[PDB]
């Protein structure tokens, strides 16, 4: 968002960090934990609002900072949630955080999904692997604002059945969601012994309950699945002007100075922290190299 004096401090320092406390730790998968945070400043906690799809810079003191997307809805005011996978140094230190500990956060950064201009149209969310958390934010924003959006579909896929993000929440939500114009599809790709569904999301796009001409599509996951998902969506009649995807590059600041999250070419040179992380379909089509 455009929060003043709390996103850049009264000292006008964009690198200034806010003190937050971890209240709940929940292990989703083996290398995955869901963290519930709140700002130790009550006014800052009550004033901090974000957009679905935006990210924050989580500074573990003495180790470094990492960019994490927000998975909770912005209308759950006071608290925000982060889902973090153990990939290396900083995340190894993060996974040792027990409730009641204090960590530093600045944000929110980037542009989220344009959920304000998605008013009065269907929602199709396609989440692969770790991309469920930003789409969890979008999904919970849609569920809190159900009267605004039409039929919504949530496709969540993972390599194994134990690596599905928010499997318990989405499985518990499926009842009364099927009656509330919400369809949840959860599938695995490399697990042929999984009792549930199997296959890639492009197989389950046909099983969606969304009107193809009036649907907003949000895709999050590895860059390699994007081309196949684009082919499937274009074949079924989803308009290319409504397809949105998220990309990841190396980030050190999140404000546009370190120059590490660069994509594109000399014709269209862009930065993830300033021009994304949400990109449109035509941006992905025009310049190669944004995928893989």
């Amino acid at each position: 968002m455009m929060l003043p004096k709390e996103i850049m401090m009264p000292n006008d320092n964009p690198y200034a960090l806010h003190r937050v406390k971890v209240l709940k730790v929940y292990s989703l998968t083996e290398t995955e934990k869901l963290f519930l945070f709140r700002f130790e400043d009550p006014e800052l906690a009550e004033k901090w609002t974000f957009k679905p799809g935006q990210f924050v810079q989580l500074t573990i003191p003495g180790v470094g900072e990492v960019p994490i997307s927000i998975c909770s809805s912005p209308m759950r005011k006071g608290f925000f949630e982060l889902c973090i996978r153990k990939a290396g140094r900083v995340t190894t230190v993060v996974h040792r955080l027990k409730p009641g500990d204090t960590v530093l956060v600045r944000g929110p950064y980037g542009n989220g999904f344009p959920v304000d201009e998605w008013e009065g149209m269907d929602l199709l969310l396609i989440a692969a692997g770790l991309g469920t958390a930003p789409l969890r934010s979008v999904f919970l924003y849609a569920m809190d604002n159900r009267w605004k959006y039409g039929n919504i579909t949530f496709i969540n896929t993972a390599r194994y059945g134990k690596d599905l993000l928010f499997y318990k929440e989405l499985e518990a939500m499926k009842d009364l969601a099927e009656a509330e114009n919400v369809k949840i599809i959860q599938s695995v790709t490399r697990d042929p012994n999984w009792p549930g569904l199997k296959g890639r999301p492009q197989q389950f796009i046909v099983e969606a309950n969304t009107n193809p001409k009036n649907t907003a599509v949000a895709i999050c996951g590895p860059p390699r699945m994007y081309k196949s998902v684009f082919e499937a969506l274009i074949n079924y009649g989803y308009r290319p002007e409504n397809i949105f995807v998220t990309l990841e590059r190396r980030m050190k600041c999140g404000i546009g100075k370190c120059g590490h999250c660069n994509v594109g070419t000399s014709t269209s040179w862009k930065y993830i922290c300033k021009d994304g992380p949400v990109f449109t379909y035509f941006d992905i089509v025009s310049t190669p190299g944004l995928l893989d």
Binding site: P14, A16, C258, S266
Partner: protein
């Protein structure tokens, strides 16, 4: 615009008077062939006719190695390390370096203004000087040869003195405080300025139009030239650490030996290094040396929306200071088919 003439015998007196405003940084000779911006104690050390500096003028605002925060790990607290910056004068800035400073201002004085950059940018007085082209200078191709703004005083070379352009109120104050040393510009000095401009335009090595360079670079990303020139590359990053318009930095948190205190550090980075694109899990978005080598060309030839220029200004530091004798302009002209 206000035009004043500084006679040849009052130049050193004016430079001495510039020390009353603050610290004076002017180009001096650090080795037999290399220059740099160093602090002035003796005014006779200033080299008015130099080609380029071993370090760009961005080192005064975008410092090469800077301490951002000091922290206590117990009671998590990051305290910003900003000192009171006193006014200083950067003398001898070429027009290409002035445009590079403007480009870096667009990068670092954006919607999130960098406090460390802005504090030092406020207190800096940029006095520009004229120059004669070298074999490595192509600022005419990038349109950074004549500066419009971004300075306070600009010194133009005349046979019998200098011509001073005043662009800001700070330059007006500098001229009006030492008005005893300045004179009035006649038609003869204007004619001499015109002659110097003609000679400067004649002294450039290349005279070409590079409008379609970005699109040809996009269309020719699978050229054999990239492999050929990347096999020569040392991955030393001098082309980025000496580039005036390179924004990249690397951050590191250093913990003191007590385990409680420490600091966060910021240093210049290069895209030629392996870890510039490493994204954890082993994936590098520029995994080969050819990829990083081409990424530098793509980044430098990109278009700056706020200014209308490329991020490359044309100083030739990447070509002159390359230890592997790799020509940036030569490879760009290979892409354009002009060789």
């Amino acid at each position: 615009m206000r035009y004043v003439k500084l006679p040849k015998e009052n130049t050193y007196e004016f430079l001495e008077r510039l020390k009353d405003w603050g610290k004076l940084y002017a180009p001096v000779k650090i080795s037999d062939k290399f220059y740099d911006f160093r602090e002035i104690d003796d005014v006779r050390k200033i080299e008015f006719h130099y080609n380029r500096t071993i370090m760009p003028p961005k080192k005064f605002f975008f410092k090469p190695r800077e301490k951002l925060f000091e922290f206590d790990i117990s009671k998590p607290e990051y305290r910003e390390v900003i000192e009171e910056v006193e006014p200083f004068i950067i003398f001898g800035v070429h027009a290409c370096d002035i445009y590079g400073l403007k480009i870096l201002d667009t990068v670092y004085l954006d919607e999130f203004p960098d406090k460390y950059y802005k504090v030092r940018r406020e207190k800096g007085i940029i006095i520009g000087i004229s120059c004669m082209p070298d074999e490595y200078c192509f600022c005419n191709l990038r349109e950074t040869d004549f500066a419009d703004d971004g300075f306070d005083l600009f010194f133009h070379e005349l046979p019998d003195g200098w011509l001073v352009r005043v662009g800001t109120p700070t330059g007006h104050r500098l001229v009006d405080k030492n008005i005893k040393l300045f004179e009035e510009v006649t038609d003869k000095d204007i004619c001499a300025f015109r002659d110097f401009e003609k000679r400067r335009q004649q002294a450039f090595k290349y005279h070409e139009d590079w409008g379609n360079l970005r699109y040809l670079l996009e269309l020719e990303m699978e050229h054999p030239m990239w492999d050929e020139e990347a096999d020569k590359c040392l991955a030393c990053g001098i082309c980025n650490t000496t580039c005036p318009t390179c924004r990249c930095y690397e951050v590191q948190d250093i913990v003191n030996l007590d385990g409680v205190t420490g600091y966060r550090e910021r240093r210049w980075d290069s895209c030629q290094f392996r870890s510039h694109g490493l994204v954890a899990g082993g994936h590098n978005f520029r995994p080969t040396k050819k990829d990083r080598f081409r990424n530098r060309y793509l980044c430098k030839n990109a278009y700056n929306e706020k200014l209308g220029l490329s991020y490359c200004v044309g100083c030739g530091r990447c070509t002159a200071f390359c230890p592997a004798n790799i020509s940036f302009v030569g490879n760009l002209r290979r892409i354009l088919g002009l060789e």
